[PDB]
């Protein structure tokens, strides 16, 4: 901090050589450095920023998964933290501002320990007696999420997820198409165990009238335009036949390495036209199929849309993988990579196909979709989100993506906690009276731990721009008196957390604010990895490139 | 296509010449580059107001919270802030009083005029609506005044008038500062009660001698004078009274010698022997009359020879140094003496009355007092401010002179006129000013409403500063002006005002038990000062500039 | 309109440095928290010292706040506060100048999280201002009004965290004797002046009741006078004696060649004349500011009479209170009277250097030691070591208040404090507590550099302050605590008053600030 250091004196380094507690200090600073950008994006409250890549383009972005994966840090300490965004949202999918915010105030809390001679032995011990206390008081206080006979433990949940982004105030919108679209595209594994995959329904970056009137499609939008302008848009009528295949459509040459050869040339040009002829064959079983709609993973040639606008089917080259795997799933199909049997013949059977009740092409704002609609065999869902231009839906697309994460964690785990600090608050009050039990050295170590919780609820009324110890005092008097209830329901002062748009103490339940708590197990676990990672360094080693 | 012709006829000035209409915003541009640095003296108005740092290119710092201070040493480059800079400059030559409310106000009728000229209003009907806006104001500040002082010297009211003053820089603690200074006053101030003689009072006689080291508990005021001198033959207690008598010479204590070529000649011997005795002798004989009348300390304008010094020291004559000549003129107020080039005999009416002249030890180094005593006051008092750190020290040295500046402000108008404080005096020309719009018609009414609106900025900087929400503080307080028909007749609603520290809501519990008050002449002034300040920028609409 | 660019105006000059944000006043205190690291070792006698070299290649090594701050050339706004506290104590006190900065870095430093959170500045202040008023008037309660056993104990704890420490027990008999040769209400600082011996052992040094100054001149006449008179007397002269122009000038017309022998011969008869008016009286020893030429220093070598000159103003005034006689510029009006003596004289080498030595006098205002040592540090740490010794004995003539060292007075201060801040007003409880806590950190550094564990320390102390009221603090030698009034350990209260006023005033400084200008 003060001066650097002596180059390698009589060590005999190429590189540079640090020890000490000064690089100690620089790691508390580079996490600090690092977390600053991520305290005024916590809550309701905060605000989102832009990055600049120094060519014009720029992306607005609230949470910190993709902020600090752009922002390129040299420091290797920092990358820690930087895949620590990733990693949460990988699993979890939310909470990437809360991870980094808590293991830099753990590093930071933490560095007064570290010049009062405990070691960090000892001082990852103290945290992790009061990590698995604060699990156990975790499981003691959540709660399931049947709950009530109303949902709206649906309604609620999205909420908190929908917090802190530009469209927190339509949330109330929202929160019925994300629980409506989940519940969609269900599907059944290992004999009764449901799973909800995450990106499987289709955000598209529509522009147009505005995010309050964006209309919930039931059913999976593909986002492809039309090959040829002459074919038939609009396809009514029901039971529309669903044709998925992948193999190579279009006139291709032969083997990968032979060379056609002939001596008569009278055949010259037979063997034009059966290149010709053998790729119109399969064109010519699907029209007896009678498939209507007919999608492609690779492109589509002239030749054979002759026959698609003559039989009046729909033609769709530059589909991508991931996307006919959901078509087959959702419509009924299945997925055909070639068409041949285990019999020595060729030929396509009727079952290959699906069904669908309506299939309509729609353009908005130079943005042609495909709307297919009414999937007798499994339902399916899109989002057709409409902002002000592309970069402001991006924003869009990650609070929709992360919303999903989060409501798909809370129908897999029906447990769930209030949010506003709440568990934050209430772990310091269950880890003092734990401090003073164990005695020896450990009681510092455990105190800081629950000292650097008391963050989140804190960084909540910073932002805010009002007074916080007035809040942390009435919230810490009410949380007090829970470790002291006197049980016997009348076991109130629990279950309450801040309100930042009045600026009151109200309890949370009431409010509709809740979050799953495997989220708070998986978040102190990995902020907590990341805080061992860091401590433990003593001198670095820097190597300079050759 | 590929270039413009880049302005043509654009020789006819220099290239580093720029012109800069009323057009393309930039008269809103100029209006948000005074609100770059406005926004600075948010943060210091008021006695929650917190310092600035100003490092220059040579490295002299100086740390403080008032304006026209601070705006010295930054180099500005806008021409209308420096209208600004020159406008608190005129308040702190004049006044010494109430420069972060010029540029408050100078700043917030720019800011609401932002507003009306994006409207439509000429520039022309804009300096006229301010003008007979200053001309109501002026006069209703007049007719809602209350309290006089009444008495020159008093223990009492003069910590109404210094306490407010100095509350704005470095508050700390009330009353170690406020006796300092009131304190200070009734020894310079020629009391003279039942004669009809004029008042008198000087900006230059109380004068802060900054020492290091210390509390600012310990500081005491001294009746005389200090300088960081050494007595070049010895030193002296003084402890024998039947007090000592003074004596004032401007020119050095040595042969008065001749201005052109002055120069030896000795023709024999004779005058060889008898030249190095001469000099003794006439120098010897100087002091026998200078010595008979009884005096034990003079003070010298410029370098001492030795030969006098010999000569002085033996009968236990002190020496001072002055090599100025503010230095010399400052100590003959406070014994009364009447200086004389010449080296005869002082006149015993101009010899000066001085008891003791102690030599002790305050900051390490050596220090000369000239403390009097009850008996034959003097003036020029100083004030012995004792701190830790230099930069603290020039700070409250010129809240003394801002202080020392207030009770100038007692002499030439005919009495004191204090006015209620903490925004009351601001918050009751809204309602009076907004009611002046509704009775005259025309479209200035506009020009007159927005003048109200700019007043509200003091309540407002007062409650941001305070770390109160400015959104519950500000309505809550006009329920006491928008309210009618109570009980009392003697209304008390007038006093009602902000509050720093305290109860919640904060309407403050008058602004009287308290003891804060404002004067009308800084309001007057700063004011006329601020109103001009406004209409110099907002009347012109080119500006041309060079080099930049 | 007079040019296509139409530059916008910006508001400052090009250069100035950034503004209002998150962060700014964060970085004031991590700047304060940077040069405090470095002062932070050096706490206690188990500390350790600095060594820096500026630019010009001079070698300094010291372990005090004051000296260590100013070689070190601080560009930093914020951080020059410090270097202002530690001056400020240094001068009006001499002693305790890293105390006080460490005290101000942790108060700035405990601040740092508040300031984080929505606490407003002066509430910060107001807490530290209103807790300090306290403070001083604890320290009055737990300073004693001690009259009884009529110096010896205050300056051995004066000399810690530095060299002469270990030699306490030969240099404080001696530093005792230092200001009681100076009497009341006086209290000069230059008779106190010691000078440079580079050469020699610490061990060697002694006593010396006067003065002893180096002559810097080799004179013609130097070894044929005595070394050793019996009976010395001392007289102060300013007269320049040599042979030269008389009064600033040099002009002399000459018609007869006769007279031009005659003028010649005039010049010198007078000089004898002038020399002959110092003989007449009787002094041995000649003292002069200005040069002696060689004809008077021979003229004085003849009949036995010791002369010296090139000596400086402030070595001449401490020359006459030695003595005890007068500065007299003319030798006409030379009287017996007014002539200084004492015991004997002595001229010994010195480091490969004279000294002319005065000592015995019946009553001698000055003390005068010569240091000697092996490295040119070595001399200069002796001499601020006993510079701040010198000025603790100083002040306990003054005022005799003693108070608990090794850290007590933190303790005892903090405990009340956590009693004021349990009573009343909600708010502030969580600012005094947080001034008390940080008030602890001089017992805090003073036993890490001891090598002990805190937290066994720490908790020692608050649970044992009950029967230990007052004189409860750290002991070194056993490796316990015990109580201080057995172990003979004192300091005045004199160094706390200052620390804390100094520091709160530090810190309330640059707590009132969050700007940060800086032209070009
Ligand atoms: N309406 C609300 N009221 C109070 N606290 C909230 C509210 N919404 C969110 N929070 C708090 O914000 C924290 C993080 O919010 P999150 O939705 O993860 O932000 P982001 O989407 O930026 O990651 C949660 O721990 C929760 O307690
Ligand atoms: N303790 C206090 N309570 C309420 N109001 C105050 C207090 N101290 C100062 N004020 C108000 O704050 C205003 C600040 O005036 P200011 O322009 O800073 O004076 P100066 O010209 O000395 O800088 C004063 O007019 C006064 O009414
Ligand atoms: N003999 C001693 N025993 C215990 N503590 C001591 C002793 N001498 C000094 N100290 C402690 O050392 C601290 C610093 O004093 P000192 O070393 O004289 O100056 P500095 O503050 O420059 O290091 C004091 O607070 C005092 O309590
Ligand atoms: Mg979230
Ligand atoms: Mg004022
Ligand atoms: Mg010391």
Redesign the interface.
């Known amino acids: 901090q003060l001066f650097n250091n002596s180059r390698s004196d009589t060590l005999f380094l190429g590189g540079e050589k640090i020890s000490g507690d000064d690089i100690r200090n620089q790691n508390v600073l580079a996490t600090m450095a690092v977390a600053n950008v991520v305290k005024s994006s916590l809550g309701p409250v905060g605000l989102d920023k832009m990055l600049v890549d120094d060519i014009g383009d720029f992306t607005v972005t609230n949470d910190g998964a993709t902020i600090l994966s752009l922002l390129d840090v040299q420091h290797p300490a920092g990358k820690i933290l930087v895949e620590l965004a990733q990693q949460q949202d990988r699993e979890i999918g939310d909470g990437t501002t809360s991870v980094v915010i808590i293991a830099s105030e753990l590093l930071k809390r933490a560095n007064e320990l570290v010049k009062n001679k405990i070691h960090p032995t000892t001082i990852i011990t103290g945290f992790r007696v009061a990590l698995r206390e604060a699990i156990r008081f975790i499981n003691e206080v959540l709660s399931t999420s049947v709950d009530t006979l109303g949902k709206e433990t649906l309604i609620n949940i999205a909420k908190t997820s929908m917090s802190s982004k530009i469209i927190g105030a339509d949330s109330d919108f929202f929160s019925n198409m994300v629980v409506d679209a989940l519940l969609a595209v269900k599907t059944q594994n290992s004999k009764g165990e449901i799973k909800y995959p995450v990106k499987a329904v289709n955000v598209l970056k529509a522009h147009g009238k505005s995010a309050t009137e964006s209309l919930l499609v039931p059913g999976y939008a593909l986002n492809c335009t039309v090959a040829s302008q002459a074919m038939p848009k609009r396809i009514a009528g029901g039971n529309v036949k669903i044709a998925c295949l992948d193999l190579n459509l279009q006139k291709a040459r032969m083997a990968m390495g032979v060379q056609i050869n002939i001596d008569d040339p009278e055949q010259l040009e037979q063997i034009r036209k059966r290149e010709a002829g053998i790729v119109l064959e399969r064109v010519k079983k699907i029209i007896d199929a009678g498939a209507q709609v007919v999608l492609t993973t690779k492109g589509i040639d002239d030749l054979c849309l002759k026959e698609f606008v003559e039989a009046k089917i729909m033609g769709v080259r530059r589909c991508k993988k991931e996307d006919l795997r959901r078509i087959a799933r959702a419509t009924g199909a299945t997925l055909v990579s070639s068409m041949s049997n285990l019999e020595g013949e060729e030929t396509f059977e009727s079952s290959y196909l699906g069904l669908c009740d309506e299939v309509v092409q729609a353009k908005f704002s130079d943005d042609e979709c495909i709307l297919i609609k009414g999937t007798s065999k499994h339902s399916s869902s899109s989002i057709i989100l409409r902002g002000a231009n592309d970069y402001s839906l991006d924003e869009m697309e990650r609070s929709l993506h992360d919303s999903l994460s989060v409501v798909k964690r809370t129908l897999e785990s029906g447990n769930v906690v209030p949010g506003g600090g709440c568990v934050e608050a209430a772990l310091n009050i269950y880890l003092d009276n734990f401090a003073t039990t164990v005695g020896s050295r450990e009681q510092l170590a455990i105190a800081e731990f629950a000292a650097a919780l008391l963050i989140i609820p804190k960084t909540l009324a910073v932002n805010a721009a009002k007074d916080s110890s007035e809040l942390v005092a009435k919230l810490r008097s009410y949380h007090a008196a829970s470790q002291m209830a006197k049980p016997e329901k009348r076991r109130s002062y629990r279950n309450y957390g801040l309100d930042l748009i009045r600026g009151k103490i109200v309890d949370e339940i009431h409010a509709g604010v809740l979050e799953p708590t495997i989220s708070k197990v998986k978040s102190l676990k990995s902020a907590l990895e990341a805080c061992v990672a860091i401590l433990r360094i003593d001198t670095m080693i820097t190597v300079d490139p050759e | 296509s590929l270039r413009?012709p880049?302005?043509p006829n654009?020789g006819?000035?220099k290239?580093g010449?720029?012109?800069?209409?009323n057009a393309?915003g930039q008269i809103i541009?100029?209006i948000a580059?005074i609100r770059?640095?406005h926004?600075?003296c948010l943060?210091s108005m008021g006695?929650?107001?917190?310092?600035?740092?100003?490092?220059?290119?040579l490295?002299k710092?100086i740390?403080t919270?008032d304006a026209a201070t601070m705006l010295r040493?930054?180099?500005?480059?806008?021409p209308a802030?420096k209208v600004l800079v020159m406008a608190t400059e005129q308040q702190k030559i004049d006044m010494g009083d109430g420069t972060n409310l010029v540029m408050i106000l100078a700043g917030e009728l720019l800011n609401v005029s932002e507003k009306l000229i994006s409207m439509g209003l000429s520039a022309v009907e804009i300096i006229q609506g301010y003008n007979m806006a200053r001309k109501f104001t002026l006069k209703e500040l007049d007719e809602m005044v209350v309290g006089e002082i009444t008495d020159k010297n008093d223990k009492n009211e003069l910590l109404k008038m210094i306490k407010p003053v100095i509350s704005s820089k470095k508050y700390?603690?009330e009353d170690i500062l406020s006796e300092l200074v009131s304190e200070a006053v009734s020894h310079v101030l020629p009391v003279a009660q039942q004669a009809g003689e004029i008042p008198y009072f000087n900006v230059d006689s109380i004068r802060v001698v900054k020492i290091?080291?210390?509390?600012?508990?310990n500081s005491t005021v001294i009746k005389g004078m200090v300088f960081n001198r050494e007595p070049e033959?010895?030193?002296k207690?003084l402890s024998e009274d039947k007090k000592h008598k003074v004596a004032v010479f401007t020119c050095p204590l040595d042969i008065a010698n001749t201005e052109t070529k002055?120069?030896?000649?000795?023709?024999?011997?004779q005058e060889?022997?008898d030249?190095?005795?001469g000099?003794?002798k006439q120098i010897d004989a100087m002091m026998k009359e200078i010595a008979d009348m009884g005096v034990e300390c003079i003070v010298a304008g410029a370098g001492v020879g030795?030969?006098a010094?010999?000569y002085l020291?033996?009968y236990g004559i002190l020496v001072l140094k002055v090599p100025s000549k503010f230095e010399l003129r400052r100590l003959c107020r406070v014994c009364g003496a009447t200086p004389l080039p010449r080296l005869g005999a002082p006149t015993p009416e101009e010899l000066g009355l001085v008891e003791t002249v102690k030599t002790?030890?305050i900051?390490?180094d050596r220090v000369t007092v000239f403390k009097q005593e009850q008996g034959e006051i003097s003036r020029t008092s100083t004030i012995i401010l004792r701190?830790?750190?230099?930069?603290?020290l020039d700070d409250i040295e010129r809240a003394i002179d801002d202080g020392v500046a207030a009770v100038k402000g007692l002499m030439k108008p005919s009495g004191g006129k204090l006015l209620p404080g903490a925004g009351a005096t601001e918050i009751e020309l809204i309602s009076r000013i907004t009611k002046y719009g509704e009775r005259t018609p025309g479209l200035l009414q506009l020009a007159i409403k927005q003048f109200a609106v700019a007043f509200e900025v003091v309540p407002r900087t007062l409650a941001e500063?305070?770390?109160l929400?400015v959104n519950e503080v500000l309505p809550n307080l006009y329920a006491a002006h928008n309210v009618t028909e109570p009980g009392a007749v003697k209304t008390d609603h007038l006093y009602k005002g902000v509050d720093?520290?305290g109860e919640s809501d904060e309407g403050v519990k008058d602004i009287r038990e308290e003891n804060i008050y404002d004067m009308l002449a800084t309001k007057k002034f700063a004011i006329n000062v601020a109103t001009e300040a406004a209409t110099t920028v907002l009347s012109i609409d080119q500006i041309?500039?060079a080099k930049? | 309109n007079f040019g296509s660019q139409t530059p916008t105006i910006v508001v400052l000059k090009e250069g100035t440095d950034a503004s209002q944000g998150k962060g700014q006043i964060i970085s004031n205190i991590n700047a304060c928290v940077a040069v405090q690291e470095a002062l932070k070792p050096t706490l206690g006698p188990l500390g350790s010292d600095i060594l820096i070299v500026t630019s010009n290649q001079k070698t300094t090594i010291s372990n005090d706040g004051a000296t260590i701050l100013k070689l070190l050339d601080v560009v930093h706004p914020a951080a020059k506060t410090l270097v202002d506290i530690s001056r400020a104590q240094d001068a009006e006190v001499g002693d305790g100048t890293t105390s006080v900065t460490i005290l101000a870095g942790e108060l700035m430093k405990e601040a740092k999280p508040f300031l984080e959170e929505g606490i407003s500045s002066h509430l910060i202040m107001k807490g530290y201002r209103k807790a300090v008023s306290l403070a001083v008037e604890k320290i009055n309660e737990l300073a004693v009004d001690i009259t009884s056993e009529k110096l010896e104990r205050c300056a051995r704890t004066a000399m810690s965290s530095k060299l002469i420490h270990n030699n306490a027990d030969f240099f404080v008999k001696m530093c005792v004797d230092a200001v009681l040769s100076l009497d009341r209400n006086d209290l000069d600082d230059k008779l106190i002046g010691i000078k440079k011996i580079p050469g020699g052992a610490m061990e060697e040094s002694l006593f010396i009741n006067g003065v002893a100054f180096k002559k810097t001149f080799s004179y013609a006449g130097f070894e044929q006078q005595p070394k050793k008179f019996n009976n010395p007397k001392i007289l102060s002269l300013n007269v320049e004696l040599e042979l030269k122009a008389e009064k600033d000038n040099a002009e002399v017309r000459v018609e007869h060649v006769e007279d031009y022998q005659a003028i010649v011969d005039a010049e010198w008869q007078l000089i004898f004349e002038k020399l002959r008016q110092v003989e007449e009286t009787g002094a041995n020893i000649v003292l002069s500011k200005l040069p002696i030429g060689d004809l008077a220093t021979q003229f004085f070598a003849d009949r036995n009479i010791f002369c010296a000159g090139r000596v400086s103003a402030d070595d001449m005034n401490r020359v006459i209170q030695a003595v005890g006689g007068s500065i007299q510029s003319t030798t006409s009006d030379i009287k017996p009277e007014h002539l200084g003596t004492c015991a004997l004289f002595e001229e010994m080498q010195i480091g490969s250097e004279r000294y002319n030595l005065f000592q015995g006098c019946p009553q001698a205002k000055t003390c005068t030691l010569l240091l000697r040592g092996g490295a040119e540090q070595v001399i200069a740490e002796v001499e601020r070591s006993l510079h701040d010794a010198i000025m603790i004995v100083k002040r306990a003539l003054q005022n005799k208040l003693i108070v608990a060292g090794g850290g007590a007075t933190e303790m005892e201060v903090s405990k009340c404090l956590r009693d004021y801040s349990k009573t009343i007003a909600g708010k502030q409880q969580m600012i005094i507590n947080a001034f008390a806590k940080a008030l602890e950190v001089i017992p805090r550094q003073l036993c890490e550099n001891a090598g002990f564990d805190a937290i066994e320390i720490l908790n020692k102390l608050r649970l044992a302050h009950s029967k230990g009221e007052k004189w409860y603090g750290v002991v070194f030698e056993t490796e316990n605590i015990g109580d201080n009034f057995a172990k003979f350990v004192w300091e005045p209260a004199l160094v706390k008053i200052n620390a804390l006023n100094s520091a709160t005033e530090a810190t309330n400084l640059i707590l009132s600030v969050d700007e940060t200008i800086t032209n070009k």
């Not at chain 2, 010449?17 to 209409?21: A, D, E, H, L, R």
């Not at chain 2, 040493?73 to 806008?78: F, G, R, T």
């Not at chain 2, 002055?262 to 011997?269: I, Q």
């Open positions: 413009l880049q302005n654009a006819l000035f290239q010449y720029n012109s800069y209409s393309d541009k100029s580059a770059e640095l926004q600075m943060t006695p929650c107001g917190r310092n600035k740092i100003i490092v220059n290119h490295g710092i740390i919270n040493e930054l180099d500005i480059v806008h802030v700390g603690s290091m080291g210390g509390s600012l508990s033959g010895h030193v207690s002055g120069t030896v000649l000795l023709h024999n011997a060889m022997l030249f190095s005795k000099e003794e030795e030969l010094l010999h020291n033996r002790m030890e900051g390490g701190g830790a750190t230099q930069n603290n500063t305070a770390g929400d720093i520290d041309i500039m930049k």
